[PDB]
Design a binder for this molecule. Structure first.
Ligand SMILES: *[C@@H]1O[C@H](CO)[C@@H](O)[C@H](O)[C@H]1NC(C)=O
Ligand SMILES: *[C@@H]1O[C@H](CO)[C@@H](O)[C@H](O)[C@H]1NC(C)=O
Lengths: 180, 192
């Protein structure tokens, strides 16, 4: 559909493995907020949006409808499960890489399905836990997902970085390299 | 008060996925608003409510029970029929004083490639932007390769507009950037 603005109010997700769910709202491809279903908390992604209120119970109640609708569909489709997809990984910096100045590495894992994945960072072949954040599963018109991970860093002339992606559609954990 | 769309109830390891997308499509402000509710099994859309259709329609044979059953209920049809005004048009009012007011000005930097000049236009919102290379106020257009619009995920965009050039004495290269958040287009020059 061709339109000036595309909004999702919202994106409802429930899957059997876990089991896990996700409730988000999107406007023009960006996440407005998500509901921590385990905490019954609304977490806005734009500070300007903190002024609004959103009942997390709606998300919980909506997700419950998805679980009931799923079990119906699992049987009726003769147990047709999800096809594992090959995710595409791209690593880039948030700003131009000026040495000695803080920056953020951005790892875009696109074409994710099913929405199950670890995204982790590596520096010189070592696990990097601090400074790592990530978005939710953002929707796509083909009904796959993409997730973006962030790694804050002070780039230097010798420290290399790898974005690591483990996925079922992946025979081996995928590694996308980045160097200043 | 952002209004959500509800989903109606139905009448390596393997995994089963269900997706519901309550979507709104806006054009020319609010004079052209369209609502499409999508019920998705795995990655296949099965049931749909298009505001331009006005009734539930089964995309595949799997959603055929649901569409027929959901259409049976006059109450459910009538709630969904009014959702365009109640959800889409209502939420666009909140968007007009928040998301649609977001103005992040881009940062423009020029640097030779790691010959090739790279104009980095980083951290801007909204996505509408135009970048043009000029050479002595003569617009370069044949040796320009622009990367696709990059979504950073934190409500900012970035784009890199390359240019392969032959540098000679006394030639200035300028990157012209136009963005809604700018009162006047930004020009970053480059001398060798
Ligand atoms: C699907 O139905 C057919 C009946 O012809 C059956 O042989 C097959 O086992 C079914 N699939 C599953 C996953 O049970
Ligand atoms: C990574 O994901 C796989 C499934 O994709 C899961 O089995 C594994 O537990 C995850 N990694 C860790 C450290 O738990």
């Amino acid at each position: 559909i061709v339109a000036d603005h595309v909004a999702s109010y919202g994106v409802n997700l429930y899957q059997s493995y876990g089991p896990s769910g996700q409730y988000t709202h999107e406007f023009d491809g960006d996440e407005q907020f998500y509901v921590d279903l385990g905490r019954k908390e609304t977490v806005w992604c734009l500070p300007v949006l903190r002024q609004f209120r959103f009942d997390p119970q709606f998300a919980l109640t909506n997700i419950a409808v998805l679980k009931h609708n799923l079990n119906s569909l699992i049987k009726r489709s003769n147990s047709t499960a999800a096809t594992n997809e090959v995710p595409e990984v791209t690593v880039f910096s948030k700003s131009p890489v000026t040495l000695g100045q803080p920056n953020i590495l951005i790892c875009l894992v696109d074409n994710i399905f099913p929405p199950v994945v670890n995204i982790t960072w590596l520096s010189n072949g070592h696990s990097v836990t601090e400074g790592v954040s990530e978005t939710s599963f953002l929707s796509k018109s083909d009904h796959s997902f993409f997730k973006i991970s962030y790694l804050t860093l002070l780039p230097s002339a010798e420290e290399s970085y790898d974005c690591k992606v483990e996925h079922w559609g992946l025979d081996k954990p995928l590694l996308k390299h980045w160097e200043p | 008060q952002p209004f959500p769309q509800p989903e109606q109830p139905f009448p390596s390891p393997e995994d089963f996925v269900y997706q519901f997308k309550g979507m709104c499509y806006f054009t020319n402000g609010t004079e052209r608003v369209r609502l499409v509710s999508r019920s998705i099994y795995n990655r296949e859309e099965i049931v749909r409510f298009d505001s331009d259709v006005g009734e539930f329609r089964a995309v595949t044979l799997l959603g055929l029970p649901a569409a027929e059953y959901w259409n049976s209920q006059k109450d459910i049809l009538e709630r969904k029929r009014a959702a365009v005004d109640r959800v889409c048009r209502h939420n666009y009012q909140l968007e007009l004083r928040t998301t649609l007011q977001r103005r992040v000005e881009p940062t423009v930097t020029i640097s030779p490639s790691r010959n090739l000049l790279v104009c980095s236009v980083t951290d801007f919102y909204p996505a509408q932007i135009k970048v043009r290379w000029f050479r002595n106020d003569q617009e370069e257009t044949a040796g320009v390769v622009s990367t696709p619009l990059i979504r950073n995920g934190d409500w900012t965009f970035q784009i890199l507009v390359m240019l392969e050039m032959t540098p000679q004495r006394g030639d200035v290269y300028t990157c012209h950037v136009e963005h809604p958040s700018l009162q006047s287009p930004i020009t970053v020059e480059w001398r060798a």
